[PDB]
Design an enzyme around this catalytic site. Sequence first.
Site, PDB file in Angstrom:
ATOM      1  N   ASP A   1      10.037   3.903   1.083  1.00  0.00           N
ATOM      2  CA  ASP A   1      10.561   2.532   1.093  1.00  0.00           C
ATOM      3  C   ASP A   1      11.513   2.138   2.225  1.00  0.00           C
ATOM      4  O   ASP A   1      11.077   1.833   3.332  1.00  0.00           O
ATOM      5  CB  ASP A   1      11.254   2.240  -0.243  1.00  0.00           C
ATOM      6  CG  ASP A   1      10.415   2.654  -1.437  1.00  0.00           C
ATOM      7  OD1 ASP A   1       9.261   2.174  -1.571  1.00  0.00           O
ATOM      8  OD2 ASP A   1      10.918   3.465  -2.245  1.00  0.00           O
TER       9      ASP A   1
ATOM     10  N   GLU B   1       3.962  11.474  -7.837  1.00  0.00           N
ATOM     11  CA  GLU B   1       5.185  12.017  -8.418  1.00  0.00           C
ATOM     12  C   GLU B   1       5.255  11.934  -9.940  1.00  0.00           C
ATOM     13  O   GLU B   1       5.584  12.916 -10.597  1.00  0.00           O
ATOM     14  CB  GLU B   1       6.413  11.309  -7.839  1.00  0.00           C
ATOM     15  CG  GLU B   1       6.444  11.221  -6.324  1.00  0.00           C
ATOM     16  CD  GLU B   1       5.586  10.090  -5.778  1.00  0.00           C
ATOM     17  OE1 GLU B   1       4.976   9.343  -6.574  1.00  0.00           O
ATOM     18  OE2 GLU B   1       5.530   9.942  -4.543  1.00  0.00           O
TER      19      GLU B   1
ATOM     20  N   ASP C   1      -0.548   8.255  -1.102  1.00  0.00           N
ATOM     21  CA  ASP C   1       0.612   7.673  -1.738  1.00  0.00           C
ATOM     22  C   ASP C   1       0.781   8.177  -3.167  1.00  0.00           C
ATOM     23  O   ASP C   1      -0.133   8.788  -3.730  1.00  0.00           O
ATOM     24  CB  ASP C   1       0.487   6.154  -1.717  1.00  0.00           C
ATOM     25  CG  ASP C   1       1.792   5.480  -1.412  1.00  0.00           C
ATOM     26  OD1 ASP C   1       1.795   4.247  -1.203  1.00  0.00           O
ATOM     27  OD2 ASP C   1       2.818   6.194  -1.381  1.00  0.00           O
TER      28      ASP C   1
END
Lengths: 757, 756, 193
Positions: A482, A419, A416
């Site tokens: 999401d 960024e 995860d």
Amino acid sequence: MKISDGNWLIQPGLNLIHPLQVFEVEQQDNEMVVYAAPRDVRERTWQLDTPLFTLRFFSPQEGIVGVRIEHFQGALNNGPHYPLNILQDVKVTIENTERYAEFKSGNLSARVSKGEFWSLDFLRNGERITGSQVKNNGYVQDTNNQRNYMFERLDLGVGETVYGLGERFTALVRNGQTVETWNRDGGTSTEQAYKNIPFYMTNRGYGVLVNHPQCVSFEVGSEKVSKVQFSVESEYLEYFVIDGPTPKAVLDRYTRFTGRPALPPAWSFGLWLTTSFTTNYDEATVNSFIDGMAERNLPLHVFHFDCFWMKAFQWCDFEWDPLTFPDPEGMIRRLKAKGLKICVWINPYIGQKSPVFKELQEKGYLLKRPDGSLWQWDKWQPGLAIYDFTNPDACKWYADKLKGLVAMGVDCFKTDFGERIPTDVQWFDGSDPQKMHNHYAYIYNELVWNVLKDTVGEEEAVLFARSASVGAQKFPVHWGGDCYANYESMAESLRGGLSIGLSGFGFWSHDIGAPAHVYKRWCAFGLLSSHSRLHGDDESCDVVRFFTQLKCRMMPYLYREAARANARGTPMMRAMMMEFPDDPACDYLDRQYMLGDNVMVAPVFTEAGDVQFYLPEGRWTHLWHNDELDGSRWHKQQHGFLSLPVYVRDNTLLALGNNDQRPDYVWHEGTAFHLFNLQDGHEAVCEVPAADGSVIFTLKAARTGNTITVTGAGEAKNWTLCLRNVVKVNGLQDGSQAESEQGLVVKPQGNALTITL
Amino acid sequence: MKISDGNWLIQPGLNLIHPLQVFEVEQQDNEMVVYAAPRDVRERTWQLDTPLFTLRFFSPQEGIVGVRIEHFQGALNNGPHYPLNILQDVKVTIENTERYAEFKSGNLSARVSKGEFWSLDFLRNGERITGSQVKNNGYVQDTNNQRNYMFERLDLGVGETVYGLGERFTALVRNGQTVETWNRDGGTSTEQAYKNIPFYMTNRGYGVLVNHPQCVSFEVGSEKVSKVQFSVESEYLEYFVIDGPTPKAVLDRYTRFTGRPALPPAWSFGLWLTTSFTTNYDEATVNSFIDGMAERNLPLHVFHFDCFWMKAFQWCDFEWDPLTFPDPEGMIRRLKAKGLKICVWINPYIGQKSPVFKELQEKGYLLKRPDGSLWQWDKWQPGLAIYDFTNPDACKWYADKLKGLVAMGVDCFKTDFGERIPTDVQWFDGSDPQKMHNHYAYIYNELVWNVLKDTVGEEEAVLFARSASVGAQKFPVHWGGDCYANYESMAESLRGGLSIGLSGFGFWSHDINTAPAHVYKRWCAFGLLSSHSRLHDESCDVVRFFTQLKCRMMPYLYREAARANARGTPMMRAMMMEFPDDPACDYLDRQYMLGDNVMVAPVFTEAGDVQFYLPEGRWTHLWHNDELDGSRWHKQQHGFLSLPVYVRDNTLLALGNNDQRPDYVWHEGTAFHLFNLQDGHEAVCEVPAADGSVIFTLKAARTGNTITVTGAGEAKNWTLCLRNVVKVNGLQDGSQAESEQGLVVKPQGNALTITL
Amino acid sequence: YKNIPFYMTNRGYGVLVNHPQCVSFEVGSEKVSKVQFSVESEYLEYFVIDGPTPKAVLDRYTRFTGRPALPPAWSFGLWLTTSFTTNYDEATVNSFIDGMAERNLPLHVFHFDCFWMKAFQWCDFEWDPLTFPDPEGMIRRLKAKGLKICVWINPYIGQKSPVFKELQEKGYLLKRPDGSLWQWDKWQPGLAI
């Protein structure tokens, strides 16, 4: 960024110079060098007091022409560079004539016009597919911010559409959009993206890779309406024009150039399952949930542990929460006792609260500011620091923890974040912070991928990565993100998955994402993707069971298509334009897609079940409803929650398994083949694969007149062949006949049969 | 304008507040007022020390719901304001329950949710067509530049596409684009536009007008992927949701609301011809240039004089260059003696060299800077100044100069610029410079248009306007600008014309140097098969062929032009507008509908290859007479005298008997053409009079294989061609004869019956 | 809330710095043994007020700047107000004073808080019909019972008030140099002065 101000002016404070005239063409071995002046320099007294552009043409792979436009060479030009596979012996031809300077690789050439009327053209067999008109590329001296840029503008033809640029959620076709290739965590409903790729394709059969890891600003028909403009803060601009008459051929070359998608393990194409965020209270609650799946005959193949398997505020220090999971390995072995594969959440950051934090701070494994202090902020985790992956010792430490997890039985990782990489920093290796921002997604995932490749084997390596960068497609299955619980978000999601495919990524996963009807519709979409994860009534259960079983049956087909992504770079979830390049009606389709070479999928985005979709030329057959529809037009249908448009192309020979409980099994044993509208003078081939993706069996069905000659070659036993929509025939040479709902089922005896209709 | 930074953050330096909770709903004659707090305010305590939004819902007319959301009302709020037609007695109903507050006008209503979950929804008979979710509208205090903005984000549904926003040259469907409604002189190949209109439409049957003359910044699915966001520097935000089950209906309400396109004279639909920017060197270089036209039998109807009829650097002092045109009046009469209408170039600026500059400066008729000095720059003209059309005497001076040209014989004007209006100025009437920038386009063209109305008559008024703003569609024929000579440019131009139609403008002209002959030839077909065409050896054949076709199509074309005036239905229609229900039409932008029944697809290749989509039905090519069935795309090759021009089925088309001019008696000698009339269908055709009113209706109704043709009104010597019918076995009250297009029937009156 | 550029010492004198704008005092805070005062001005004026004793200084100072008026005796009574925003109606304030009547707690003056007006419209002098339907009736009833009444007021007005537009049209509210209204969201939405 805005360079021009309409066609007659330049943005205030910008000074521009362009390659307006060829001065000298030189040949340096395998490369062509063109020196161009920003003004007239024919008279010797003018051959001074002027800048000079240096354009170097080279070819890293057959059919790929690289262009490097340079102003100053004295720049540092540090930081990381994209992981491109560059060959030195690519065969090319260089022709320096009176009027042109042409460089060619394969069928693709770059031609520069001499004398008056400068021009840079990209030709395919002598036909212009694109190029840069005079004054459309050059150097930008920005006196407002004292920064300098290089830019280029490649022409767009009439009706020429643009795709790619990563996993984006804006309109599929990029024309009209401004795009900044810069990884960001902004969700899935904005112009921002977790996975940016400075690569774009068009419906005219070519692609383009702007070889710059730092931010590249694209104006796709947004400044110059019929041109794809791109600029970058640099003293040189380098990009690669990638040919492939077909979009598919472009992806082939592009992935060969930057990285082939790996073939994920068959078990990864099953239903992944994670419990509602923050509800993993302990082993019991987890077992109660898994048992609940089995009590309702719902196939579960992979279980994922969310963030809370670690203590709060100290995320990814890799310490299990004692108060939650007292016995980690005990619980994992018990779970794996059952077919279940295990996945756990991780990321490249670490909260200050973690006991390990101070240790890492002392050893210097965390990203620092130029002054030596730790780089920190309060987003995501308090006092969050970042693992510096340019430091070998930090990498080793990080990898070791991962191996520790694999040693306990964890099979994969959900990588995860990754960024939000700061630029006001100093990397251990001194990388350029501007380039590290995006590339970090690559090194971070590469590190994790190598751990699996070294513990479970390359063939077993799977990941659920949210961030990406060029070359990152090599570490398979990128997760969509999401997504809110509404139809528009579901449609946004698809556009994102389609777009990542058009960007060189062969696999894409997302969560079955709150009205019950929305959830049920999303289910069909979820299971009809390469990878799907169920996140968190009774009909809902029927829907999940239905499509989970359906996907398991389609594995002989699905998996062979998955091998295609690894070999050719052809993503499994394909935008319609990619599969039917020459059909004008496919240019903008973004609400449907081809799942493999022969299946058209169209999720429904309404509660009532209304859906509209287009079908290219031919006669299609619903996978299981068996109804037929003619192509080259749009259709409207109404589907219940256990249905959606899933049509199979004509002249097709599908392979379905006899196991609807799991993805991984012997696909060539008891396999049921299905023939769809085999036309007179047509041959339908089918390749069932082996667990490793190789073609283990090949079935063929050729039609001459009204005689069908089905011939098999390879390894397969007790298989059948069902002639769809054929109630009965009058000629079955060497085989048994039978009746079914979907048509006449022929049981052979030896891989060699002949049937007269 | 970027407000959010991804879904989790807000751009640095911005402080936002939104209407989160309804505090009170008060009704005030025709208007519903909603007070919304930016935070929980249920308890009496804490019902202070907090901002408060005031939302007013009203209806300027049936099917239009206005929304004004304000922060501070104490701001200056000076004009100009859009010229909206606001009806005061519209029938509306306010329903204020304890769960919802709903304002309704026609089938459209605005509903606000009360309680814990704020919501602003727009319904069409109870169903949501769009709306604003909580925190998707509000106030933006920008601490970076010390400016304040108001913003809103209207939802977009699955597959919902956006169109409009003026004459733009980017991709037709706006999804993914950022758009600033601010007039600029940026050419026709960038994101800039000469004609900006803060109005957009969707394929869901509703439109939205953001009522702000100053710059409106739109993020059409470009910030929030599935929302149309718009912001403006203002202490309040007002927009109008315009219902219209169908796009045409939206445009009907929108043009009734902001202005109906006027009906241009028939003669303006002919071929316009202009002098090359570098050629009109004498009264002879032209007086003889139009003869070459005549010699080659090339019908020319309007002649246009470029900037050079005046002395260089003195542009627009209205003085004829003595060394070039010694006798302007005499020259105009000769041209008119050749059957030509005359148009001259003008603009709202004036160069300092002009002997008149000094005069205008002394009288204070030029735009001034706050200190009273003159605003000037060197773009376009040296020491160029702007006529302050906000100053009454300056308007009269300018108007009198225009009246002087009409007196000489000039028939119309090419209102050429009007975009680059500075803001660091002080208008004579104290207008807000920010709102004046765009509105200036309107004021300028209204002035010129009224002069024509007062001199040649309202029915004779016509223009070739480069600039525009809301309401300016009332001053017919907006010109698409200069295009570069290539196919990609030709395509860009079309997108522009289609977009301006989707923006309330009913007519659109464009031009047909150093262009390859083939491109030029393909463009001619496109040019003449448009509302208005301006021109500027096989090329002669092409121009002649298509001009003659357009002249023959006038009986049909002009009736369609009256549609624009009556309903605001542009002549050049985007496929999406004509077939809102068809999925295959959402992105069609290389083809169009010319009026109700003709599909035109320009070819963008030398070889002649072209691809187009045809909606359901069996179509017939206007003159080749071949048929194709719709619901799918087609590929074809055409020579230079051909291109896809298909007629819809069940249509009765009126063609005239004169191919030399557009203005003639259409209802005499008219040739009717019946195309694929299905059983149980009726086809109506209304031929118009010169003023656009229908002067004769012809009807063909089919039952079984019997076609009953009935006509009313005045028309004579007309015929009816049964396209693709070789022969019938029954004809009552009429004569018949064979024909290339098919059997032609001659009536014995105007009530014959035919048996197939 | 109440600033006065005047000070007294235990040495029997006072000093008034005669400037209504901000006066900055450094009382033994810069120079420990001196009272320093400064003001943005091209001149400085102050008054040294004698009076051997502190009382004589205040006598002269109040004579110079204003004598406190003598309030009516009844005001010296026990003033009462309810909890903020609890005045739900006439019946509610009565039962409250009656609760005072019993327990035998003398109540002389009653005070009506901000909420006697509509919220966000504070000080447009407009009674809230929903709370106090009959204002004059209620007042006379409270009085004509021995009670004197006080009402809350201030020099600002919230934009929601229906009279705001009027005051704005008449030019009665504090304006910025450019002629627009001065406003902010503190205390009341779109508050004006």
